[PDB]
Design a protein around this motif. Structure first.
Motif, PDB file in Angstrom:
ATOM      1  N   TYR A 279      32.615  40.091  31.808  1.00 47.04           N
ATOM      2  CA  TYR A 279      33.966  39.530  31.808  1.00 47.04           C
ATOM      3  C   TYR A 279      34.071  38.403  32.839  1.00 47.04           C
ATOM      4  CZ  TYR A 279      35.757  42.862  28.499  1.00 47.04           C
ATOM      5  OH  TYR A 279      35.988  43.568  27.341  1.00 47.04           O
ATOM      6  N   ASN A 280      34.372  37.204  32.367  1.00 53.26           N
ATOM      7  CA  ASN A 280      34.599  36.099  33.291  1.00 53.26           C
ATOM      8  C   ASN A 280      35.979  36.076  33.951  1.00 53.26           C
ATOM      9  OD1 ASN A 280      32.044  35.131  33.017  1.00 53.26           O
ATOM     10  ND2 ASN A 280      32.584  33.243  31.902  1.00 53.26           N
ATOM     11  N   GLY A 281      36.020  35.457  35.128  1.00 55.56           N
ATOM     12  CA  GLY A 281      37.267  35.226  35.834  1.00 55.56           C
ATOM     13  C   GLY A 281      37.757  36.393  36.664  1.00 55.56           C
ATOM     14  N   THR A 282      36.937  37.437  36.763  1.00 53.74           N
ATOM     15  CA  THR A 282      37.364  38.669  37.423  1.00 53.74           C
ATOM     16  C   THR A 282      36.347  39.141  38.452  1.00 53.74           C
ATOM     17  OG1 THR A 282      38.391  40.844  37.046  1.00 53.74           O
ATOM     18  CG2 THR A 282      36.403  40.391  35.766  1.00 53.74           C
ATOM     19  N   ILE A 283      36.640  40.294  39.050  1.00 51.89           N
ATOM     20  CA  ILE A 283      35.950  40.767  40.232  1.00 51.89           C
ATOM     21  C   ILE A 283      35.498  42.222  40.046  1.00 51.89           C
ATOM     22  CG2 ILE A 283      37.201  39.239  41.803  1.00 51.89           C
ATOM     23  CD1 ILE A 283      38.869  41.721  42.552  1.00 51.89           C
ATOM     24  N   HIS A 284      34.751  42.734  41.014  1.00 50.61           N
ATOM     25  CA  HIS A 284      34.373  44.150  40.984  1.00 50.61           C
ATOM     26  C   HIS A 284      35.614  45.026  41.004  1.00 50.61           C
ATOM     27  CE1 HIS A 284      31.262  47.186  41.133  1.00 50.61           C
ATOM     28  NE2 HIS A 284      31.974  47.849  42.028  1.00 50.61           N
ATOM     29  N   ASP A 285      35.469  46.249  40.489  1.00 50.81           N
ATOM     30  CA  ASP A 285      36.558  47.244  40.446  1.00 50.81           C
ATOM     31  C   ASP A 285      37.729  46.869  39.536  1.00 50.81           C
ATOM     32  OD1 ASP A 285      35.618  49.376  42.128  1.00 50.81           O
ATOM     33  OD2 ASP A 285      35.948  48.106  43.894  1.00 50.81           O
ATOM     34  N   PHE A 286      37.535  45.931  38.603  1.00 52.89           N
ATOM     35  CA  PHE A 286      38.695  45.347  37.928  1.00 52.89           C
ATOM     36  C   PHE A 286      39.370  46.238  36.877  1.00 52.89           C
ATOM     37  CE2 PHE A 286      37.180  43.901  33.640  1.00 52.89           C
ATOM     38  CZ  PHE A 286      35.808  43.958  33.792  1.00 52.89           C
ATOM     39  N   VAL A 287      38.722  47.306  36.404  1.00 59.58           N
ATOM     40  CA  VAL A 287      39.419  48.229  35.500  1.00 59.58           C
ATOM     41  C   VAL A 287      40.093  49.394  36.226  1.00 59.58           C
ATOM     42  CG1 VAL A 287      37.945  47.678  33.524  1.00 59.58           C
ATOM     43  CG2 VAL A 287      37.387  49.725  34.950  1.00 59.58           C
ATOM     44  N   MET A 288      39.820  49.559  37.517  1.00 61.03           N
ATOM     45  CA  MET A 288      40.462  50.608  38.327  1.00 61.03           C
ATOM     46  C   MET A 288      41.687  50.117  39.102  1.00 61.03           C
ATOM     47  SD  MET A 288      40.653  51.549  41.851  1.00 61.03           S
ATOM     48  CE  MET A 288      39.132  51.151  42.692  1.00 61.03           C
ATOM     49  N   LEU A 289      41.590  48.917  39.676  1.00 60.62           N
ATOM     50  CA  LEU A 289      42.621  48.414  40.584  1.00 60.62           C
ATOM     51  C   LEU A 289      43.933  48.167  39.860  1.00 60.62           C
ATOM     52  CD1 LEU A 289      40.517  45.874  42.710  1.00 60.62           C
ATOM     53  CD2 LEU A 289      41.530  48.035  43.515  1.00 60.62           C
ATOM     54  N   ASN A 290      44.976  48.854  40.309  1.00 60.28           N
ATOM     55  CA  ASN A 290      46.276  48.735  39.659  1.00 60.28           C
ATOM     56  C   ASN A 290      46.834  47.316  39.756  1.00 60.28           C
ATOM     57  OD1 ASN A 290      46.250  51.416  38.853  1.00 60.28           O
ATOM     58  ND2 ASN A 290      47.550  52.119  40.536  1.00 60.28           N
ATOM     59  N   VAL A 291      46.537  46.619  40.849  1.00 56.73           N
ATOM     60  CA  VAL A 291      47.039  45.265  41.024  1.00 56.73           C
ATOM     61  C   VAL A 291      46.493  44.317  39.934  1.00 56.73           C
ATOM     62  CG1 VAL A 291      45.214  44.591  42.644  1.00 56.73           C
ATOM     63  CG2 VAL A 291      47.453  43.407  42.712  1.00 56.73           C
ATOM     64  N   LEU A 292      45.383  44.694  39.293  1.00 56.67           N
ATOM     65  CA  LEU A 292      44.804  43.863  38.221  1.00 56.67           C
ATOM     66  C   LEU A 292      45.025  44.423  36.811  1.00 56.67           C
ATOM     67  CD1 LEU A 292      41.321  42.920  39.747  1.00 56.67           C
ATOM     68  CD2 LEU A 292      43.539  41.795  40.111  1.00 56.67           C
ATOM     69  N   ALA A 293      45.817  45.481  36.673  1.00 56.73           N
ATOM     70  CA  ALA A 293      45.909  46.201  35.398  1.00 56.73           C
ATOM     71  C   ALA A 293      46.462  45.384  34.216  1.00 56.73           C
ATOM     72  CB  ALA A 293      46.761  47.469  35.587  1.00 56.73           C
ATOM     73  N   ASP A 294      47.242  44.349  34.509  1.00 52.84           N
ATOM     74  CA  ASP A 294      47.843  43.503  33.478  1.00 52.84           C
ATOM     75  C   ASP A 294      47.090  42.173  33.332  1.00 52.84           C
ATOM     76  OD1 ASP A 294      49.914  43.152  31.489  1.00 52.84           O
ATOM     77  OD2 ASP A 294      50.931  41.792  32.868  1.00 52.84           O
ATOM     78  N   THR A 295      45.984  42.012  34.054  1.00 51.81           N
ATOM     79  CA  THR A 295      45.138  40.810  33.881  1.00 51.81           C
ATOM     80  C   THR A 295      44.334  40.894  32.587  1.00 51.81           C
ATOM     81  OG1 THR A 295      43.148  41.600  35.079  1.00 51.81           O
ATOM     82  CG2 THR A 295      44.947  40.583  36.367  1.00 51.81           C
ATOM     83  N   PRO A 296      43.971  39.745  32.008  1.00 54.46           N
ATOM     84  CA  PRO A 296      43.328  39.855  30.689  1.00 54.46           C
ATOM     85  C   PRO A 296      41.989  40.573  30.727  1.00 54.46           C
ATOM     86  CG  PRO A 296      43.516  37.550  31.398  1.00 54.46           C
ATOM     87  CD  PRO A 296      44.349  38.356  32.336  1.00 54.46           C
ATOM     88  N   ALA A 297      41.238  40.432  31.817  1.00 50.99           N
ATOM     89  CA  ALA A 297      39.937  41.089  31.886  1.00 50.99           C
ATOM     90  C   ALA A 297      40.092  42.604  31.937  1.00 50.99           C
ATOM     91  CB  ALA A 297      39.127  40.594  33.092  1.00 50.99           C
ATOM     92  N   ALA A 298      41.043  43.081  32.737  1.00 49.35           N
ATOM     93  CA  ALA A 298      41.257  44.526  32.842  1.00 49.35           C
ATOM     94  C   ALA A 298      41.702  45.106  31.501  1.00 49.35           C
ATOM     95  CB  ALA A 298      42.279  44.851  33.915  1.00 49.35           C
ATOM     96  N   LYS A 299      42.668  44.450  30.856  1.00 48.72           N
ATOM     97  CA  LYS A 299      43.189  44.933  29.589  1.00 48.72           C
ATOM     98  C   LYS A 299      42.088  44.926  28.537  1.00 48.72           C
ATOM     99  CE  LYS A 299      47.147  43.120  28.302  1.00 48.72           C
ATOM    100  NZ  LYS A 299      47.941  41.872  28.132  1.00 48.72           N
ATOM    101  N   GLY A 300      41.280  43.863  28.519  1.00 44.34           N
ATOM    102  CA  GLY A 300      40.233  43.747  27.529  1.00 44.34           C
ATOM    103  C   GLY A 300      39.164  44.816  27.665  1.00 44.34           C
ATOM    104  N   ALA A 301      38.741  45.048  28.901  1.00 48.38           N
ATOM    105  CA  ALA A 301      37.639  45.948  29.207  1.00 48.38           C
ATOM    106  C   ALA A 301      38.065  47.389  28.939  1.00 48.38           C
ATOM    107  CB  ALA A 301      37.189  45.773  30.644  1.00 48.38           C
TER     108      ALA A 301
END
Ligand code: MG
Ligand code: MG
Ligand code: MG
Lengths: 315, 315
Positions: A279-301
């Motif tokens: 997933y481009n444009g994102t960082i480690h822990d991106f499917v766990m971190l609530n602050v990123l939950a509505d980002t496209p990478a988190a939603k996609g993954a």
């Protein structure tokens, strides 16, 4: 490379707030920092929850949380889940939203292993707890009301390390049977001088010094880190062949990126059916971190992993 | 890097007996190679098909194929689809399995534009046909029994170029409204000296000389290639802002990889919500080619795109 904009705002806010480095903190403090980040009011899928203990593992007991889609009393397929956050941190609260998403999207029971954390417990306590709970689930399916012939394993970060090693142990020990495995940005090596460790040594979010510290909390001093039960990138094509189909998801901007993708290659070379996506444009822990939950990478993954598991367990 | 094994088997068969390079063939011959490669009996999703003509576009008539989930007569959301294969090649047969998957997974009508191919038709015939059909669908929703407020566009390879350009033209001309856009491994630039062009210049499968030839069939001699209606990587943050949320899927081993990922970043910097995913172990054209249909990357990307469209059009 350049971050997605919500993700960027998070990183900048983190810099501005100026908190202590993780490796200057006590385990309790480090734990409380992540717990506090994940304690916000966020939308979460509805589930039924049971907290209990299975009388297995090297210490005689392992705490688990069993999650099911709310109101569902069917004999469901089951996911055994191994959480991340550096071996030191993480609990049922920090990973709550993520594992609820997996349970509901997969339409499966999910058994969350609340393993003994480091440094108080060091290698190999957690992986043996992890393996023991996976075996327990397979051997107590009537009591848990699950279908042991549709058992998957999954984990994030160091929990992806645990996923890989449980697969390896199940191969060596002749079971239990695993239907599929999911590894979110797994830890698989300890080569702190590879491409992504070098490029992203100073972040974002996860740094090389932080990984150095986590590894030192997990391991006894001086242990040979090349052993496959510690760094599964070194597993033989033998230990890998015959493992369950795998989904491996990595982040573009992540010290651990290259070893996760290298591990996906190793599995594939061994004849394992591997779905591997960066997933481009994102960082480690991106499917766990609530602050990123509505980002496209988190939603996609999360949608991808949910669907992958649903297909594996119901197809 | 190393390919998934079935994908590598395909590449090995080409190197052994693939024959003359595609760009040394006449366009008729090239067309027949791909048509033949894709005409094998293969499991495909069940659909209803209507071939017809809309009296719009620069020629006065654009051939289309309308696909629906089999037997479904509901007022459905709709996808307008722009196929790939180098501007020279491709038709309703070569992309049949792929667009059936998208229709059934999105639970949507899909309008496949059988645009005029190059070199017989140069730029800008196809992109004007493509936009015209998109406008037509929005403006004749009762004829087509679709919901014009849930209209997505999608395409692969040069068809991803077309998707990007139709988005831009819709911004420029005040409509129609687009709900989402999906770009499989799009063509977005004509810099044949960038990173992935240099790394994968002689393959696997797609080569730098092939792309040079395709571009030359598409474009009049001496045209300014930096026009964003030709190379949408050059679109201004203004032509881009306001565009529909995008899914961009790239292949690891592909000359076109870097420009696809760079385009995704350009959209993201413009405030568009971009889901961008790189599939490792695979090649260009990996969601269209029937020989790769059962490979993990193909299954993964089609499921991802299908679900993304389903969520966009039904959520
Ligand atoms: Mg990663
Ligand atoms: Mg690509
Ligand atoms: Mg983005």
């Amino acid at each position: 490379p350049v971050l997605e904009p919500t993700t960027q705002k998070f990183i900048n806010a983190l810099s501005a707030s100026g908190g202590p480095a993780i490796y200057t903190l006590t385990p309790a403090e480090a734990r409380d920092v992540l717990s506090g980040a994940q304690s916000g009011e966020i939308a979460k899928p509805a589930v039924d929850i049971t907290d209990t203990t299975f009388a297995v593992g090297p210490t005689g007991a392992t705490k688990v949380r069993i999650i099911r889609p709310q109101g569902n009393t069917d004999r469901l397929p089951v996911i055994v889940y191994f959480h991340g956050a550096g071996w030191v941190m993480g609990d049922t609260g920090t990973h709550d939203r993520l594992v609820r998403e997996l349970s509901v999207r997969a339409n499966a029971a999910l058994v969350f292993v609340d393993y003994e954390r480091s440094p108080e417990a060091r290698y190999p306590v957690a992986i043996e707890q992890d393996y023991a709970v996976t075996k327990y689930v397979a051997e107590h399916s009537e009591q848990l009301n699950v279908d042991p012939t549709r058992l998957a394993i999954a984990g994030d970060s160091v929990g992806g390390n645990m996923t890989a090693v449980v697969s390896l142990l199940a191969q060596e020990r002749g079971g239990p049977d695993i239907t599929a495995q999911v590894l979110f940005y797994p830890v698989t090596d300890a080569d702190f001088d590879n491409g992504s460790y070098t490029e992203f040594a100073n972040g974002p979010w996860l740094t090389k010094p932080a990984m150095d510290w986590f590894w030192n909390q997990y391991l006894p001093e001086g242990i040979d880190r090349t052993d496959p039960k510690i760094t599964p990138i070194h597993a033989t094509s033998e230990q890998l062949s015959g493992q369950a189909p795998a989904l491996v998801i990595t982040a573009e901007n992540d010290v651990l990126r290259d070893e996760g993708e290298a591990y996906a290659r190793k599995l594939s070379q061994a004849g394992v059916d591997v779905t591997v996506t960066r997933y481009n444009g994102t960082i480690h822990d991106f499917v766990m971190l609530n602050v990123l939950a509505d980002t496209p990478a988190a939603k996609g993954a999360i949608a991808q992993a949910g669907q992958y598991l649903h297909t594996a367990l119901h197809g």
